mmCIF file of C-alpha atoms and ligand atoms in Angstrom:
data_model
loop_
_atom_site.group_PDB
_atom_site.id
_atom_site.type_symbol
_atom_site.label_atom_id
_atom_site.label_comp_id
_atom_site.label_asym_id
_atom_site.label_seq_id
_atom_site.Cartn_x
_atom_site.Cartn_y
_atom_site.Cartn_z
ATOM 1 C CA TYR A 1 0.421 30.256 -0.990
ATOM 2 C CA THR A 2 -2.301 28.515 0.798
ATOM 3 C CA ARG A 3 -2.177 25.678 3.154
ATOM 4 C CA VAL A 4 -2.598 22.186 1.883
ATOM 5 C CA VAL A 5 -5.151 20.029 3.704
ATOM 6 C CA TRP A 6 -3.922 16.435 3.947
ATOM 7 C CA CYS A 7 -6.399 13.592 4.389
ATOM 8 C CA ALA A 8 -5.454 11.065 7.066
ATOM 9 C CA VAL A 9 -7.035 7.601 7.112
ATOM 10 C CA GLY A 10 -7.871 6.560 10.687
ATOM 11 C CA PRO A 11 -6.680 7.735 14.149
ATOM 12 C CA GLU A 12 -2.989 6.753 13.840
ATOM 13 C CA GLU A 13 -2.502 8.622 10.583
ATOM 14 C CA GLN A 14 -4.380 11.567 12.140
ATOM 15 C CA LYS A 15 -1.862 11.755 15.008
ATOM 16 C CA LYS A 16 1.096 11.748 12.598
ATOM 17 C CA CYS A 17 -0.554 14.357 10.398
ATOM 18 C CA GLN A 18 -1.110 16.591 13.455
ATOM 19 C CA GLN A 19 2.621 16.437 14.281
ATOM 20 C CA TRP A 20 3.444 17.299 10.670
ATOM 21 C CA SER A 21 0.939 20.193 10.827
ATOM 22 C CA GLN A 22 2.482 21.592 14.021
ATOM 23 C CA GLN A 23 6.073 21.324 12.699
ATOM 24 C CA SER A 24 5.172 22.856 9.309
ATOM 25 C CA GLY A 25 3.762 25.954 11.017
ATOM 26 C CA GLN A 26 0.282 25.184 9.648
ATOM 27 C CA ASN A 27 1.312 25.099 5.968
ATOM 28 C CA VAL A 28 -0.193 21.641 6.100
ATOM 29 C CA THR A 29 -3.372 20.983 8.066
ATOM 30 C CA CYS A 30 -5.325 17.751 8.551
ATOM 31 C CA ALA A 31 -8.680 16.271 7.679
ATOM 32 C CA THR A 32 -9.459 12.726 8.849
ATOM 33 C CA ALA A 33 -11.715 9.968 7.530
ATOM 34 C CA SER A 34 -12.314 6.341 8.457
ATOM 35 C CA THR A 35 -11.464 4.933 5.017
ATOM 36 C CA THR A 36 -9.498 5.763 1.893
ATOM 37 C CA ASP A 37 -12.729 6.018 -0.124
ATOM 38 C CA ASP A 38 -14.081 8.614 2.311
ATOM 39 C CA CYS A 39 -10.837 10.603 1.964
ATOM 40 C CA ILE A 40 -11.275 10.560 -1.832
ATOM 41 C CA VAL A 41 -14.751 12.015 -1.384
ATOM 42 C CA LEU A 42 -13.402 14.795 0.854
ATOM 43 C CA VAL A 43 -10.884 15.673 -1.869
ATOM 44 C CA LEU A 44 -13.613 15.707 -4.550
ATOM 45 C CA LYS A 45 -15.719 18.030 -2.355
ATOM 46 C CA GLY A 46 -12.693 20.281 -1.914
ATOM 47 C CA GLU A 47 -12.634 19.812 1.861
ATOM 48 C CA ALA A 48 -9.242 18.116 1.653
ATOM 49 C CA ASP A 49 -6.479 18.658 -0.932
ATOM 50 C CA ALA A 50 -4.495 15.442 -1.179
ATOM 51 C CA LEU A 51 -3.359 12.069 0.122
ATOM 52 C CA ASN A 52 -0.967 9.277 -0.905
ATOM 53 C CA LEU A 53 -2.650 6.248 -2.516
ATOM 54 C CA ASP A 54 -1.910 2.666 -3.528
ATOM 55 C CA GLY A 55 -2.423 2.037 -7.287
ATOM 56 C CA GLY A 56 -5.791 0.337 -6.777
ATOM 57 C CA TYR A 57 -7.166 3.526 -5.189
ATOM 58 C CA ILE A 58 -5.544 5.689 -7.875
ATOM 59 C CA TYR A 59 -7.809 3.799 -10.285
ATOM 60 C CA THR A 60 -10.890 4.704 -8.194
ATOM 61 C CA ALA A 61 -9.721 8.312 -7.794
ATOM 62 C CA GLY A 62 -8.827 8.641 -11.481
ATOM 63 C CA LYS A 63 -12.307 7.748 -12.706
ATOM 64 C CA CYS A 64 -13.503 10.653 -10.530
ATOM 65 C CA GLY A 65 -11.070 13.152 -12.061
ATOM 66 C CA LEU A 66 -8.252 13.131 -9.493
ATOM 67 C CA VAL A 67 -4.686 13.128 -10.867
ATOM 68 C CA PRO A 68 -1.305 11.741 -9.753
ATOM 69 C CA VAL A 69 1.007 14.542 -8.594
ATOM 70 C CA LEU A 70 4.201 13.008 -7.164
ATOM 71 C CA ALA A 71 5.203 9.376 -6.621
ATOM 72 C CA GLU A 72 6.964 7.495 -3.834
ATOM 73 C CA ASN A 73 10.503 6.657 -4.862
ATOM 74 C CA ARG A 74 12.585 4.126 -2.951
ATOM 75 C CA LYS A 75 16.275 3.147 -3.081
ATOM 76 C CA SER A 76 17.432 2.047 -6.546
ATOM 77 C CA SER A 77 20.415 0.786 -8.543
ATOM 78 C CA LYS A 78 20.016 2.047 -12.143
ATOM 79 C CA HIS A 79 20.103 5.806 -12.940
ATOM 80 C CA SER A 80 22.664 6.184 -10.137
ATOM 81 C CA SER A 81 23.812 9.779 -10.658
ATOM 82 C CA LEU A 82 20.347 11.348 -10.936
ATOM 83 C CA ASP A 83 18.683 13.010 -7.932
ATOM 84 C CA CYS A 84 15.844 11.119 -6.193
ATOM 85 C CA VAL A 85 13.187 13.730 -7.037
ATOM 86 C CA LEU A 86 14.001 13.426 -10.758
ATOM 87 C CA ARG A 87 14.686 9.676 -10.983
ATOM 88 C CA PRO A 88 12.152 7.388 -12.710
ATOM 89 C CA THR A 89 10.194 5.120 -10.354
ATOM 90 C CA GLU A 90 10.792 1.390 -10.671
ATOM 91 C CA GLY A 91 7.654 -0.092 -9.149
ATOM 92 C CA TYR A 92 7.386 -2.787 -6.507
ATOM 93 C CA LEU A 93 7.001 -6.566 -6.727
ATOM 94 C CA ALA A 94 3.718 -8.131 -5.666
ATOM 95 C CA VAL A 95 4.390 -11.535 -4.078
ATOM 96 C CA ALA A 96 2.586 -14.368 -2.322
ATOM 97 C CA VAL A 97 4.328 -15.435 0.871
ATOM 98 C CA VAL A 98 3.999 -18.597 2.954
ATOM 99 C CA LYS A 99 5.792 -20.340 5.837
ATOM 100 C CA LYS A 100 8.554 -22.802 4.809
ATOM 101 C CA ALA A 101 7.010 -25.233 7.338
ATOM 102 C CA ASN A 102 3.736 -25.242 5.387
ATOM 103 C CA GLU A 103 5.209 -27.785 2.933
ATOM 104 C CA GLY A 104 3.592 -28.715 -0.346
ATOM 105 C CA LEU A 105 1.547 -25.499 -0.330
ATOM 106 C CA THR A 106 1.957 -23.932 -3.817
ATOM 107 C CA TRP A 107 0.115 -21.531 -6.106
ATOM 108 C CA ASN A 108 -1.814 -24.574 -7.397
ATOM 109 C CA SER A 109 -3.041 -25.753 -3.981
ATOM 110 C CA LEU A 110 -4.271 -22.400 -2.554
ATOM 111 C CA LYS A 111 -7.958 -23.354 -2.895
ATOM 112 C CA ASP A 112 -9.697 -23.655 0.515
ATOM 113 C CA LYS A 113 -6.684 -22.308 2.454
ATOM 114 C CA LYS A 114 -6.599 -19.172 4.673
ATOM 115 C CA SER A 115 -5.478 -15.861 3.199
ATOM 116 C CA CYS A 116 -4.199 -12.473 4.436
ATOM 117 C CA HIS A 117 -4.760 -9.378 2.250
ATOM 118 C CA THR A 118 -3.618 -5.766 2.745
ATOM 119 C CA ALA A 119 -7.068 -4.465 1.852
ATOM 120 C CA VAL A 120 -9.813 -4.924 -0.712
ATOM 121 C CA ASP A 121 -9.098 -2.827 -3.840
ATOM 122 C CA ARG A 122 -5.345 -2.571 -3.202
ATOM 123 C CA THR A 123 -2.726 -3.687 -5.790
ATOM 124 C CA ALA A 124 -0.598 -6.390 -4.110
ATOM 125 C CA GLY A 125 -3.140 -7.365 -1.513
ATOM 126 C CA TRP A 126 -6.136 -7.771 -3.777
ATOM 127 C CA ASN A 127 -6.287 -6.697 -7.426
ATOM 128 C CA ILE A 128 -3.315 -8.739 -8.651
ATOM 129 C CA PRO A 129 -3.883 -12.015 -6.735
ATOM 130 C CA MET A 130 -7.696 -12.031 -7.093
ATOM 131 C CA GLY A 131 -7.476 -10.998 -10.755
ATOM 132 C CA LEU A 132 -5.182 -13.979 -11.394
ATOM 133 C CA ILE A 133 -7.456 -16.310 -9.413
ATOM 134 C CA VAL A 134 -10.639 -15.193 -11.226
ATOM 135 C CA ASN A 135 -8.932 -15.900 -14.579
ATOM 136 C CA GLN A 136 -7.476 -19.279 -13.681
ATOM 137 C CA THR A 137 -10.797 -20.496 -12.282
ATOM 138 C CA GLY A 138 -13.071 -18.737 -14.777
ATOM 139 C CA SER A 139 -15.400 -17.684 -11.963
ATOM 140 C CA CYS A 140 -16.375 -14.428 -10.255
ATOM 141 C CA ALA A 141 -16.743 -16.230 -6.934
ATOM 142 C CA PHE A 142 -13.426 -15.076 -5.446
ATOM 143 C CA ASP A 143 -15.366 -14.815 -2.186
ATOM 144 C CA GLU A 144 -15.496 -18.572 -2.347
ATOM 145 C CA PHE A 145 -11.933 -19.447 -3.156
ATOM 146 C CA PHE A 146 -10.268 -19.241 0.266
ATOM 147 C CA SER A 147 -11.953 -20.885 3.281
ATOM 148 C CA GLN A 148 -11.331 -17.834 5.504
ATOM 149 C CA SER A 149 -9.464 -14.554 5.040
ATOM 150 C CA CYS A 150 -8.724 -11.147 6.456
ATOM 151 C CA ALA A 151 -9.384 -8.687 3.634
ATOM 152 C CA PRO A 152 -10.026 -5.309 5.292
ATOM 153 C CA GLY A 153 -12.963 -3.515 3.626
ATOM 154 C CA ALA A 154 -15.102 -6.606 2.926
ATOM 155 C CA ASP A 155 -18.375 -7.441 4.739
ATOM 156 C CA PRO A 156 -17.453 -8.026 8.426
ATOM 157 C CA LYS A 157 -19.905 -10.940 8.642
ATOM 158 C CA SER A 158 -18.515 -12.670 5.523
ATOM 159 C CA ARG A 159 -15.730 -15.279 5.305
ATOM 160 C CA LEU A 160 -13.481 -12.560 3.851
ATOM 161 C CA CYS A 161 -13.349 -10.897 7.298
ATOM 162 C CA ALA A 162 -13.281 -14.063 9.439
ATOM 163 C CA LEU A 163 -9.595 -13.810 10.255
ATOM 164 C CA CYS A 164 -9.484 -10.031 10.887
ATOM 165 C CA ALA A 165 -9.011 -9.065 14.547
ATOM 166 C CA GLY A 166 -9.944 -5.377 15.150
ATOM 167 C CA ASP A 167 -8.232 -3.021 17.677
ATOM 168 C CA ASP A 168 -6.847 -3.678 21.082
ATOM 169 C CA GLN A 169 -10.516 -3.909 22.235
ATOM 170 C CA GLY A 170 -11.752 -6.106 19.402
ATOM 171 C CA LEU A 171 -13.658 -3.173 17.860
ATOM 172 C CA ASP A 172 -13.558 -2.121 14.188
ATOM 173 C CA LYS A 173 -13.076 -5.661 12.931
ATOM 174 C CA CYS A 174 -12.148 -5.616 9.224
ATOM 175 C CA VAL A 175 -12.102 -1.817 8.902
ATOM 176 C CA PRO A 176 -9.720 -0.739 6.100
ATOM 177 C CA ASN A 177 -7.497 1.468 8.275
ATOM 178 C CA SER A 178 -4.603 0.886 10.707
ATOM 179 C CA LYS A 179 -6.925 0.285 13.680
ATOM 180 C CA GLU A 180 -7.462 -3.220 12.253
ATOM 181 C CA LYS A 181 -4.586 -5.409 13.493
ATOM 182 C CA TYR A 182 -4.048 -7.129 10.124
ATOM 183 C CA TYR A 183 -4.463 -4.089 7.837
ATOM 184 C CA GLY A 184 -1.959 -3.018 5.145
ATOM 185 C CA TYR A 185 1.397 -4.524 4.140
ATOM 186 C CA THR A 186 2.651 -4.959 7.735
ATOM 187 C CA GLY A 187 -0.732 -6.217 8.988
ATOM 188 C CA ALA A 188 -1.126 -8.870 6.300
ATOM 189 C CA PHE A 189 2.452 -10.057 6.887
ATOM 190 C CA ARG A 190 1.693 -10.270 10.634
ATOM 191 C CA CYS A 191 -1.423 -12.327 9.829
ATOM 192 C CA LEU A 192 0.936 -14.840 8.155
ATOM 193 C CA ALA A 193 3.690 -14.520 10.782
ATOM 194 C CA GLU A 194 1.257 -15.413 13.594
ATOM 195 C CA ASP A 195 -0.063 -18.353 11.542
ATOM 196 C CA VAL A 196 -3.552 -16.896 11.330
ATOM 197 C CA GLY A 197 -3.448 -17.345 7.557
ATOM 198 C CA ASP A 198 -1.596 -19.719 5.211
ATOM 199 C CA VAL A 199 -0.646 -17.116 2.626
ATOM 200 C CA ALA A 200 -0.087 -13.358 2.626
ATOM 201 C CA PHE A 201 -0.374 -11.145 -0.470
ATOM 202 C CA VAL A 202 2.084 -8.337 0.064
ATOM 203 C CA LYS A 203 5.105 -6.811 -1.630
ATOM 204 C CA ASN A 204 8.654 -8.099 -1.662
ATOM 205 C CA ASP A 205 9.886 -5.233 0.564
ATOM 206 C CA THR A 206 7.523 -6.160 3.390
ATOM 207 C CA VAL A 207 9.246 -9.510 3.980
ATOM 208 C CA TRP A 208 12.716 -7.936 4.247
ATOM 209 C CA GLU A 209 11.662 -5.020 6.498
ATOM 210 C CA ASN A 210 9.990 -7.259 9.038
ATOM 211 C CA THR A 211 12.583 -10.043 9.407
ATOM 212 C CA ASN A 212 16.156 -10.591 10.658
ATOM 213 C CA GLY A 213 15.981 -7.819 13.273
ATOM 214 C CA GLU A 214 14.935 -5.117 10.772
ATOM 215 C CA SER A 215 11.828 -4.623 12.907
ATOM 216 C CA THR A 216 11.962 -4.694 16.708
ATOM 217 C CA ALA A 217 8.190 -5.102 16.958
ATOM 218 C CA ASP A 218 7.246 -7.796 19.478
ATOM 219 C CA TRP A 219 5.694 -10.059 16.824
ATOM 220 C CA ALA A 220 8.522 -9.546 14.305
ATOM 221 C CA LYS A 221 11.754 -9.566 16.353
ATOM 222 C CA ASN A 222 12.241 -13.352 16.089
ATOM 223 C CA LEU A 223 11.222 -13.738 12.450
ATOM 224 C CA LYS A 224 13.824 -15.175 10.084
ATOM 225 C CA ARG A 225 13.796 -14.667 6.306
ATOM 226 C CA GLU A 226 14.670 -18.360 5.817
ATOM 227 C CA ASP A 227 11.435 -19.515 7.454
ATOM 228 C CA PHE A 228 9.530 -18.000 4.516
ATOM 229 C CA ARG A 229 9.007 -18.918 0.851
ATOM 230 C CA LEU A 230 7.493 -17.147 -2.152
ATOM 231 C CA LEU A 231 4.878 -18.845 -4.329
ATOM 232 C CA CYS A 232 5.682 -18.632 -8.050
ATOM 233 C CA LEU A 233 3.144 -18.752 -10.839
ATOM 234 C CA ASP A 234 4.825 -21.874 -12.260
ATOM 235 C CA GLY A 235 3.962 -23.876 -9.141
ATOM 236 C CA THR A 236 7.387 -23.705 -7.489
ATOM 237 C CA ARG A 237 8.470 -22.285 -4.134
ATOM 238 C CA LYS A 238 11.541 -20.073 -3.845
ATOM 239 C CA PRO A 239 13.517 -18.221 -1.161
ATOM 240 C CA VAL A 240 12.586 -14.582 -0.658
ATOM 241 C CA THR A 241 15.922 -13.682 -2.279
ATOM 242 C CA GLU A 242 14.456 -14.745 -5.628
ATOM 243 C CA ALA A 243 11.648 -12.200 -5.926
ATOM 244 C CA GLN A 244 12.810 -10.963 -9.362
ATOM 245 C CA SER A 245 12.022 -14.419 -10.774
ATOM 246 C CA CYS A 246 9.136 -15.321 -8.503
ATOM 247 C CA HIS A 247 6.526 -12.536 -8.284
ATOM 248 C CA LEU A 248 2.905 -12.123 -9.316
ATOM 249 C CA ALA A 249 3.400 -8.743 -11.023
ATOM 250 C CA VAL A 250 5.233 -5.456 -10.835
ATOM 251 C CA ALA A 251 3.014 -2.714 -9.345
ATOM 252 C CA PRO A 252 3.151 1.072 -9.868
ATOM 253 C CA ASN A 253 4.427 2.985 -6.834
ATOM 254 C CA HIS A 254 1.952 4.627 -4.425
ATOM 255 C CA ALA A 255 1.454 8.262 -5.394
ATOM 256 C CA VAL A 256 0.013 11.514 -4.154
ATOM 257 C CA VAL A 257 -3.238 12.520 -5.848
ATOM 258 C CA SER A 258 -5.282 15.713 -5.810
ATOM 259 C CA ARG A 259 -7.994 17.451 -7.816
ATOM 260 C CA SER A 260 -6.610 18.545 -11.137
ATOM 261 C CA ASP A 261 -7.315 22.196 -10.330
ATOM 262 C CA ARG A 262 -5.167 21.890 -7.175
ATOM 263 C CA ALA A 263 -2.280 19.785 -8.553
ATOM 264 C CA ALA A 264 0.212 22.624 -9.120
ATOM 265 C CA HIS A 265 -0.297 24.022 -5.640
ATOM 266 C CA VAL A 266 -0.023 20.627 -3.912
ATOM 267 C CA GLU A 267 3.180 19.810 -5.824
ATOM 268 C CA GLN A 268 4.823 23.100 -4.782
ATOM 269 C CA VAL A 269 4.068 22.713 -1.073
ATOM 270 C CA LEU A 270 5.088 19.030 -0.920
ATOM 271 C CA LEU A 271 8.482 19.581 -2.587
ATOM 272 C CA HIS A 272 9.259 22.230 0.063
ATOM 273 C CA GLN A 273 7.932 19.978 2.857
ATOM 274 C CA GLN A 274 10.239 17.108 1.877
ATOM 275 C CA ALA A 275 13.279 19.402 1.765
ATOM 276 C CA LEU A 276 12.480 20.115 5.437
ATOM 277 C CA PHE A 277 11.256 16.712 6.684
ATOM 278 C CA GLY A 278 12.316 14.155 4.047
ATOM 279 C CA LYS A 279 15.253 11.710 3.770
ATOM 280 C CA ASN A 280 18.056 14.205 4.426
ATOM 281 C CA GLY A 281 15.847 17.143 5.362
ATOM 282 C CA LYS A 282 16.817 20.162 7.448
ATOM 283 C CA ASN A 283 14.626 19.006 10.327
ATOM 284 C CA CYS A 284 14.849 15.205 10.096
ATOM 285 C CA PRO A 285 15.717 13.364 12.217
ATOM 286 C CA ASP A 286 16.106 16.439 14.449
ATOM 287 C CA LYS A 287 12.458 17.489 14.826
ATOM 288 C CA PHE A 288 10.197 15.452 12.518
ATOM 289 C CA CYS A 289 10.574 12.879 9.750
ATOM 290 C CA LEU A 290 7.798 12.650 7.173
ATOM 291 C CA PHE A 291 8.827 9.154 6.039
ATOM 292 C CA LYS A 292 9.028 7.456 9.445
ATOM 293 C CA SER A 293 6.373 5.886 11.687
ATOM 294 C CA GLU A 294 8.048 2.735 13.080
ATOM 295 C CA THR A 295 7.259 0.128 10.356
ATOM 296 C CA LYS A 296 3.640 1.285 10.371
ATOM 297 C CA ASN A 297 3.668 3.004 6.961
ATOM 298 C CA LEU A 298 1.534 5.979 8.107
ATOM 299 C CA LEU A 299 0.721 8.545 5.363
ATOM 300 C CA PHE A 300 3.705 7.285 3.349
ATOM 301 C CA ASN A 301 5.609 3.994 3.183
ATOM 302 C CA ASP A 302 8.529 3.955 5.635
ATOM 303 C CA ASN A 303 10.957 2.878 2.903
ATOM 304 C CA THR A 304 10.247 6.032 0.856
ATOM 305 C CA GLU A 305 13.464 7.884 -0.069
ATOM 306 C CA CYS A 306 11.614 10.878 -1.566
ATOM 307 C CA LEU A 307 8.550 11.951 -3.522
ATOM 308 C CA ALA A 308 9.481 12.155 -7.226
ATOM 309 C CA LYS A 309 8.206 14.290 -10.104
ATOM 310 C CA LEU A 310 6.415 12.281 -12.756
ATOM 311 C CA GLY A 311 7.344 13.612 -16.201
ATOM 312 C CA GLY A 312 5.298 13.211 -19.325
ATOM 313 C CA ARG A 313 2.604 14.733 -17.069
ATOM 314 C CA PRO A 314 0.777 11.398 -17.101
ATOM 315 C CA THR A 315 -2.932 10.872 -16.725
ATOM 316 C CA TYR A 316 -3.939 8.312 -14.093
ATOM 317 C CA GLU A 317 -4.218 5.706 -16.830
ATOM 318 C CA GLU A 318 -0.632 6.260 -18.137
ATOM 319 C CA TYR A 319 0.685 6.340 -14.629
ATOM 320 C CA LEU A 320 -0.878 2.955 -13.798
ATOM 321 C CA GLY A 321 0.017 1.531 -17.233
ATOM 322 C CA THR A 322 -2.388 -0.242 -19.758
ATOM 323 C CA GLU A 323 -1.237 -3.728 -18.506
ATOM 324 C CA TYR A 324 -2.562 -2.841 -14.898
ATOM 325 C CA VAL A 325 -5.647 -0.838 -15.945
ATOM 326 C CA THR A 326 -7.036 -3.705 -18.030
ATOM 327 C CA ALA A 327 -6.441 -6.124 -15.160
ATOM 328 C CA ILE A 328 -8.532 -3.979 -12.771
ATOM 329 C CA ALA A 329 -11.313 -3.405 -15.326
ATOM 330 C CA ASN A 330 -11.735 -7.155 -15.884
ATOM 331 C CA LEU A 331 -11.769 -7.944 -12.147
ATOM 332 C CA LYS A 332 -14.290 -5.124 -11.609
ATOM 333 C CA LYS A 333 -16.678 -6.912 -13.997
ATOM 334 C CA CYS A 334 -17.243 -9.492 -11.244
ATOM 335 C CA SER A 335 -18.747 -7.541 -8.343
ATOM 336 C CA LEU A 336 -17.210 0.909 -16.773
ATOM 337 C CA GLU A 337 -16.798 4.682 -17.275
ATOM 338 C CA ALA A 338 -18.007 6.887 -14.385
ATOM 339 C CA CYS A 339 -17.131 8.055 -10.864
ATOM 340 C CA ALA A 340 -18.355 5.464 -8.343
ATOM 341 C CA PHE A 341 -19.391 8.181 -5.874
HETATM 342 C C1 MMA B 401 5.133 0.320 -17.391
HETATM 343 O O1 MMA B 401 5.217 1.505 -18.171
HETATM 344 C C2 MMA B 401 4.039 2.177 -18.566
HETATM 345 O O2 MMA B 401 3.564 1.643 -19.785
HETATM 346 C C3 MMA B 401 2.305 2.169 -20.158
HETATM 347 C C4 MMA B 401 1.791 1.414 -21.383
HETATM 348 O O3 MMA B 401 0.658 0.648 -21.034
HETATM 349 C C5 MMA B 401 2.421 3.670 -20.423
HETATM 350 O O4 MMA B 401 1.138 4.212 -20.645
HETATM 351 C C6 MMA B 401 3.075 4.399 -19.250
HETATM 352 O O5 MMA B 401 3.420 5.714 -19.628
HETATM 353 C C7 MMA B 401 4.317 3.670 -18.737
HETATM 354 O O6 MMA B 401 5.398 3.867 -19.623
HETATM 355 FE FE1 FE B 402 0.444 -1.053 -2.765
HETATM 356 ZN ZN1 ZN B 403 7.800 -9.943 -13.898
HETATM 357 ZN ZN1 ZN B 404 0.392 11.558 -21.710
#
């Protein structure tokens, strides 16, 4: 029984963590850092215990000895009778999204266009699309493919940050945290929605959750699913209803990681925390909901049903899968066995 120290990325996550801390009676406390990489370092030092990470960061964390503990699980069809916490995760679909009005724009004509990315090093926003582009062009100059982009985490003076906007005051341009207007799934989709970019690399869920009244955010309230198309690898364009036949890859779900020596303790505390503040928790929506933050995906994705046990006690490599690990390794050769910190 000790507290678990969660690592929040940026000021907005910090605020949500503080609410969680208060409601949990200090069983969970908060450490804050400006980037995901800095949070990983805090965990390695033992100054923080855990945080929830996209697959691209699990790769970084894994090389440094951190392990997956529990995974985000969202609504599913198969394995219907089984409880959420025990149900296998299905993974999400990485897609490339454009405006219907941008006619004749296909996977094969993306060169020199404007792109919107969740963040550098993330699965749907970066690793998958850039990995595919590097291959198809046979060049490590992915910094040269698009004319301008917003890829949070890149050099703020480079073309890869040209479209990023910063915070209400125009500060923190291109920072890889929610202070940057176009950061993350929602941010990259907004970058496309506002016609700042020509293409957004996000997941299939992002399109649905931010269209047809699903989001009441000022920029999203008038967005219609029909005004968007997905780019398929075969050069065609399809409606967003066809994601199962028109995606770039299937990605492993975001997951909670911790130091191996702390895994058992983190797992215990989190399972109890979700019984109190999760999907149908004792205190949600009454007092506090761990999986809500108004489409902002703070700490956890808003569409998370529960955190699920893994099973087979997988290493980070088995969790990510050989097909994804080799993809990252090859892309990493552009810009092999050691912790990068
Ligand atoms: C997509 O499923 C994954 O496949 C890889 C094989 O690369 C395994 O290591 C892992 O446990 C999972 O079953
Ligand atoms: Fe992701
Ligand atoms: Zn597929
Ligand atoms: Zn194993």
